[PDB]
Design a protein around this ligand. Structure first.
Ligand SMILES: [Cl-]
Ligand SMILES: [Cl-]
Ligand SMILES: [Cl-]
Ligand SMILES: [Mg+2]
Ligand SMILES: [Mg+2]
Ligand SMILES: [Mg+2]
Ligand SMILES: [Mg+2]
Ligand SMILES: [Mg+2]
Ligand SMILES: [Mg+2]
Ligand SMILES: [Mg+2]
Ligand SMILES: [Mg+2]
Ligand SMILES: [Mg+2]
Ligand SMILES: [Mg+2]
Ligand SMILES: [Mg+2]
Ligand SMILES: [Mg+2]
Ligand SMILES: [Mg+2]
Ligand SMILES: [Mg+2]
Ligand SMILES: [Mg+2]
Ligand SMILES: [Mg+2]
Ligand SMILES: [Mg+2]
Ligand SMILES: [Mg+2]
Ligand SMILES: [Mg+2]
Ligand SMILES: [Mg+2]
Ligand SMILES: [Mg+2]
Ligand SMILES: [Mg+2]
Ligand SMILES: [Mg+2]
Ligand SMILES: [Mg+2]
Ligand SMILES: [Mg+2]
Ligand SMILES: [Mg+2]
Ligand SMILES: [Mg+2]
Ligand SMILES: [Mg+2]
Ligand SMILES: [Mg+2]
Ligand code: NA
Ligand code: NA
Ligand code: NA
Ligand code: NA
Ligand code: NA
Ligand code: NA
Ligand code: NA
Ligand code: NA
Ligand code: NA
Ligand code: NA
Ligand code: NA
Ligand code: NA
Ligand code: NA
Ligand code: NA
Ligand SMILES: [Sr+2]
Ligand SMILES: [Sr+2]
Ligand SMILES: [Sr+2]
Ligand SMILES: [Sr+2]
Ligand SMILES: [Sr+2]
Ligand SMILES: [Sr+2]
Ligand SMILES: [Sr+2]
Ligand SMILES: [Sr+2]
Ligand SMILES: [Sr+2]
Ligand SMILES: [Sr+2]
Ligand SMILES: [Sr+2]
Ligand SMILES: [Sr+2]
Ligand SMILES: [Sr+2]
Ligand SMILES: [Sr+2]
Ligand SMILES: [Sr+2]
Ligand SMILES: [Sr+2]
Ligand SMILES: [Sr+2]
Ligand SMILES: [Sr+2]
Ligand SMILES: [Sr+2]
Ligand SMILES: [Sr+2]
Ligand SMILES: [Sr+2]
Ligand SMILES: [Sr+2]
Ligand SMILES: [Sr+2]
Ligand SMILES: [Sr+2]
Ligand SMILES: [Sr+2]
Ligand SMILES: [Sr+2]
Ligand SMILES: [Sr+2]
Ligand SMILES: [Sr+2]
Ligand SMILES: [Sr+2]
Ligand SMILES: [Sr+2]
Ligand SMILES: [Sr+2]
Ligand SMILES: [Sr+2]
Ligand SMILES: [Sr+2]
Ligand SMILES: [Sr+2]
Ligand SMILES: [Sr+2]
Ligand SMILES: [Sr+2]
Lengths: 73, 56, 237, 46
RNA sequence: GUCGGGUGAGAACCCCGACGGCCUAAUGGAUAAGGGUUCCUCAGCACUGCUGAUCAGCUGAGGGUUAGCCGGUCCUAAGUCUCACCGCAACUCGACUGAGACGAAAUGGGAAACAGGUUAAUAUUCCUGUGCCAUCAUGCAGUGAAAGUUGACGCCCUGGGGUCGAUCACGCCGGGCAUCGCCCGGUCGAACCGUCCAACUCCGUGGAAGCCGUAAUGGCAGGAAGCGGACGAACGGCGGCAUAGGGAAACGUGAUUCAACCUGGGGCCCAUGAAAAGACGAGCAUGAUGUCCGUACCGAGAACCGACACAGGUGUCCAUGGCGGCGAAAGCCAAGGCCUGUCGGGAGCAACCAACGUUAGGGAAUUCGGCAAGUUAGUCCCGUACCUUCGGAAGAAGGGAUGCCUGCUCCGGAACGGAGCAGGUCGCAGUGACUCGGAAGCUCGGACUGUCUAGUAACAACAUAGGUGACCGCAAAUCCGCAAGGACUCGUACGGUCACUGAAUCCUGCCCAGUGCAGGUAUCUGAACACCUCGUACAAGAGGACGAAGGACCUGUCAACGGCGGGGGUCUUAAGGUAGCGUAGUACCUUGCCGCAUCAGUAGCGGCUUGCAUGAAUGGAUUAACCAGAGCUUCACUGUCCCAACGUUGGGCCCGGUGAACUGUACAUUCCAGUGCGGAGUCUGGAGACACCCAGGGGGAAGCGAAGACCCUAUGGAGCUUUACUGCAGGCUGUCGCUGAGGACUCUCACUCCGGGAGGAGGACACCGAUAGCCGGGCA
RNA sequence: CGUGGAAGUCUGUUAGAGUUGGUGUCCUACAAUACCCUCUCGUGAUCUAUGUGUAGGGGUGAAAGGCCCAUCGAGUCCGGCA
């Protein structure tokens, strides 16, 4: 998704940002139904396009390994 | 752009206007303070000892 | 010489201040008497320009709309509890004594009832460890052990907006846009590229600092540049 | 530029100060206006 | 500009007509700021106007600016001020906090006006017509009334609706044209009152297991398409307005593309995109009231700023006038404005200079260097290398095509939209003017975009993402203040502070001896106070005892300042140059040696390299891409040169008018020698020399211009550095007061902080006043 | 293959901003920093109007000792001052 960077910037610019952008424009699980309709709304804000469950989550990744630790205890 | 003649073009601002108290074109309408009589800054009148040679 | 950049800072002029008028809210905790009879439904999840991470719009039992700091997972429709006997669910605000051990907690208070001081940034947490009658040890994000008062309120769960610092800025344009909304002067001109008259590391026919970078803690403001009270420097060795 | 009421009263008087010394003052003193102002060459107040 | 003509004592430049041009985002229209009467009329020419003037922004005297509905006024914005409070020796000083006020005239919010007519000059203000808003009064309605909505909001892409405009069709009205019958202009008509609704959301019906739908994304058994329906848009349509108005007349009808205006869908953010007053919620009739301030003109190559009627500078709206073409591009032309970027006359008009055209043959031989100029050039098709971070390179390169006419096929609803085929035919030339890349290759630097020395430096310097290190748990680190107090901070380690290096990729060796910083320290050193001894009827005073930070001293640390040699097969002072790179922007010797390239190469590229004196974040190496960055080579091109010629326009020369300045000890027609303070028109000797004037190019007057910036001197100045001198901030530390109860400790009562409060934390410490020792270019 | 329409992307005398070379013109100027041709950027760390804040050993400074009204290695005025 970092093809807008052109001949400039570098490898770590088009590997990391492109990875974390192809990962967020994807289909993720929702806690109010169980569907793949989770889209982004900005920095940290995650929204479902079903019964529009506008929730919280990791900046670019919906569920961080730190945000899943709250479930264990 | 040179600091001389061409920079003199952007000079269409009003700062010093005729004062209410003394009447000299020294009332800074943006500061609401007079540079001659001190209207808007002091209750007294702006006078200074250096406005005249020491022993006069 | 002249006053260095860090001296012009403390003056508090427009250039160095934070655009407070463009900021949302002073995220604090609610004042319950004693009993936990307060609860609230999360209506919205907004963006905080003051601290980048998401901020939850909560409407309470008595209709008091206040913006609270948002922990991971919490969404619209969800109910949270604020008070002494609150539920041990993510997003609920209750004192350290009432919170069990080995639980990741955030928005921790220093002195009880200050509205929260510690563990607030994007995705951080705090580990609650020892439980006595006098003390409640908490492990802060830096790894420091803070011996806290058990009467100090805290929100259960990790902060939302995690893993933000893990993605690069790519361009200065992205850094510009960020810094315009904070209390910082940007860009950063190295003290070495300056004149002798402007900084202690300034001057010279080439670029290098005059004296060694490490400076005494007793150093006066205007000479306190570089490595302030370094116990060491470098990577390996 | 928008002038106020007082500003108008003033610019008004300055225009009457621009009138010549009448023909009879010359015949009474048996033979010069010093506050002679031009709209281009001179500068007024405000 | 030219010929006529007008007024006039007087006319190149004042005015009429004609003919001829100039301006097209402005040289037109409306305005903000600023100007201030410069607007209008009449009378004038002593002043001002680059000449003249009968003209004028000039001079003199009159006249001119009319608003409930256009601004202001009101609202609040960054932010400002006053009062209180507090500090200060004090204030006109200063931070917090409370309260009030001010803060927006184009261009934030906002109750309400349109069409025409009128003047020498105003105009939604006056006048005619019509309409609209508010408060209030009376009469009717109504008891709802405040929940909610509105005011009120980022950027990028996009569909829908839709007016003006422009163009096409046809009809009517008026004009132009003189082979044809084409060409131009007009065909009008507001606000407001009424009414219609797409999009959107939603309800009922329905019952899809694959369908529905889009420019795209999408949508659905938690209920799709289809069907009916509630709410619901324009600055739009339709009706009224209007036997109003305007028009000499006709006083149209349809269409496409559609600014404005309306309404949706979509995407981006380590950026999240004002507030408040007011309005809506929530009726109607009649009547009344709606004060106050602005209102002229300019808005620029003459009304502003720049001393000027200055080639400079200065915001906004008209971004849809016609052809053109991708185009708000060029070129040409309307509407409109102008001939005032305001001196003229004459000479084939010389030399010489500024812009500039064409130059045979050669083609960079010119020069430090292709400086200057030039070459290519739009669109279509074929084709496109090394390398590469896979994005790019790349429009690489290279090759072909390109008009007009006739008749057609295809895409689409269609355009006055696009793409194609066949035959016909003109020129030297078909992107025919205009618009419109020259191409390639090697090396250096910096990654990139960006920043900069307003006015001789745009660059390799600055910045940047990226990398690293340092300090801090918030009563923090860092910083401002004399204090009261404040910035960071509506912030909290995924933070912000202080520094360094400078994308990515591959790495980043060795040394902690010195300096720095930090930690520890048995022992040494270590100030004042208090204590102990002697001395004083007391004071001064002599010694002792104790002892903090600090120093000694030990340890840690170089992505911390820095270092990585000589000698021999160790020594200084810790180690003693590892990867790479290398005659370098670093190498003196040096035009290093070999090679490539040229006839010839102090250049350039490659290799070697003992490196005077390369080298790892004082970052080392490599590099795709990028660059008005430095160097070199080739192809192409050319007046750069061989070597200069002709031409073009404005000057230059002569005539009218206008009319400065730089410079001037005096004398002065010089030249060749000499002499002299050694660089003479002027002295000595000779030579030469009739006077004046025109043009010239500048040899001389050590020409003019500037009390040399160089250099030295002066017991000159300043900016800057530091282990110069001395001091001050400031930090650290002991001590005395604040300061209380029972060399280690308990308490709460002062004091501090936190909680709204209850009360909670801390506690004689801390803060502050005083003193003492250390550090102390941060400052003098 | 298409749809889509990203960008400190691209060409661009679109508005606008900047100022490389000519070391051209000018240099008692049109101008106490101008003219012309060339050249650069032109959806962004962009350009601009008005309002507002920071003040002299102090501001501001993508750092050039740059800028703070033709004044900057410490503004200007008046005084100290003859
Ligand atoms: Cl940051
Ligand atoms: Cl107005
Ligand atoms: Cl749509
Ligand atoms: Mg210094
Ligand atoms: Mg800022
Ligand atoms: Mg908060
Ligand atoms: Mg920097
Ligand atoms: Mg420098
Ligand atoms: Mg460097
Ligand atoms: Mg360095
Ligand atoms: Mg008059
Ligand atoms: Mg008029
Ligand atoms: Mg003129
Ligand atoms: Mg020739
Ligand atoms: Mg030669
Ligand atoms: Mg068809
Ligand atoms: Mg660069
Ligand atoms: Mg310059
Ligand atoms: Mg440049
Ligand atoms: Mg960095
Ligand atoms: Mg960093
Ligand atoms: Mg650099
Ligand atoms: Mg190293
Ligand atoms: Mg060599
Ligand atoms: Mg070289
Ligand atoms: Mg010197
Ligand atoms: Mg000196
Ligand atoms: Mg307090
Ligand atoms: Mg000094
Ligand atoms: Mg050139
Ligand atoms: Mg400003
Ligand atoms: Mg310098
Ligand atoms: Na004037
Ligand atoms: Na004339
Ligand atoms: Na309507
Ligand atoms: Na057109
Ligand atoms: Na750019
Ligand atoms: Na060492
Ligand atoms: Na070295
Ligand atoms: Na550039
Ligand atoms: Na020529
Ligand atoms: Na001469
Ligand atoms: Na100096
Ligand atoms: Na694709
Ligand atoms: Na130029
Ligand atoms: Na000063
Ligand atoms: Sr200029
Ligand atoms: Sr201006
Ligand atoms: Sr005041
Ligand atoms: Sr006085
Ligand atoms: Sr508080
Ligand atoms: Sr707080
Ligand atoms: Sr230095
Ligand atoms: Sr190491
Ligand atoms: Sr003037
Ligand atoms: Sr005359
Ligand atoms: Sr006139
Ligand atoms: Sr007001
Ligand atoms: Sr307005
Ligand atoms: Sr349309
Ligand atoms: Sr007018
Ligand atoms: Sr105008
Ligand atoms: Sr102009
Ligand atoms: Sr015309
Ligand atoms: Sr004239
Ligand atoms: Sr010919
Ligand atoms: Sr050559
Ligand atoms: Sr040569
Ligand atoms: Sr070609
Ligand atoms: Sr490099
Ligand atoms: Sr500049
Ligand atoms: Sr690197
Ligand atoms: Sr050391
Ligand atoms: Sr070696
Ligand atoms: Sr001459
Ligand atoms: Sr761009
Ligand atoms: Sr461009
Ligand atoms: Sr040069
Ligand atoms: Sr010049
Ligand atoms: Sr030229
Ligand atoms: Sr564009
Ligand atoms: Sr003096």
């Amino acid at each position: 998704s970092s093809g807008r960077f052109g001949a400039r910037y570098g490898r770590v610019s088009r590997r990391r940002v492109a990875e974390i952008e192809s990962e967020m424009n994807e289909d993720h699980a929702c806690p109010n139904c169980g569907e793949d309709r989770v889209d982004r709304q900005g920095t940290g804000i995650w929204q479902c396009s079903y019964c529009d469950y506008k929730f919280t989550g990791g900046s670019y990744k919906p569920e961080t390994p730190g945000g899943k630790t709250v479930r264990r205890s | 752009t040179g600091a001389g003649t061409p920079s003199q073009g952007k000079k269409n601002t009003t700062t010093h206007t005729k004062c209410r108290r003394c009447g000299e074109k020294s009332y800074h309408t943006k500061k609401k303070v007079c540079s001659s009589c001190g209207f808007g800054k002091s209750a007294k009148r702006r006078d200074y000892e250096w406005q005249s040679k020491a022993g006069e | 010489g002249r006053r260095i950049q860090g001296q012009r800072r403390g003056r508090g002029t427009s250039t160095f201040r934070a655009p407070s008028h463009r900021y949302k809210a002073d995220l604090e905790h609610r004042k319950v008497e004693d009993g936990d009879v307060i609860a609230g439904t999360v209506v919205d999840i907004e963006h905080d320009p003051a601290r980048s991470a998401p901020v939850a719009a909560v409407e309470f039992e008595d209709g008091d709309r206040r913006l609270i700091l948002a922990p991971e997972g919490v969404g619209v429709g969800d109910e949270l509890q604020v008070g002494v006997s609150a539920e041990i669910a993510p997003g609920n605000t209750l004192p350290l004594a009432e919170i069990p051990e080995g639980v990741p907690v955030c928005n921790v208070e220093s002195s009880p009832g200050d509205g929260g001081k510690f563990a607030r940034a994007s995705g951080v947490n705090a580990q609650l460890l020892t439980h006595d009658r006098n003390v409640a040890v908490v492990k802060l994000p830096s790894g420091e052990m803070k011996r806290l008062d058990p009467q100090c309120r805290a929100t259960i769960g990790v902060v939302a907006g995690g893993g933000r610092t893990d993605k690069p800025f790519v361009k200065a344009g992205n850094k510009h846009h960020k810094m315009k909304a904070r209390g910082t002067k940007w860009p950063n001109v190295r003290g070495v590229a300056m004149n002798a008259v402007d900084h202690p590391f300034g001057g010279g026919g080439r670029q290098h600092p005059g004296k060694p970078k490490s400076i005494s803690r007793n150093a006066p403001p205007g000479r306190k540049v570089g490595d302030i009270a370094s116990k060491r420097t470098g990577r390996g060795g | 530029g928008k002038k106020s009421k007082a500003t108008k009263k003033r610019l008004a008087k300055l225009d009457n100060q621009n009138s010549r010394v009448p023909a009879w003052v010359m015949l009474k003193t048996d033979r010069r206006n010093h506050k002679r102002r031009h709209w281009r060459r001179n500068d007024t107040d405000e």
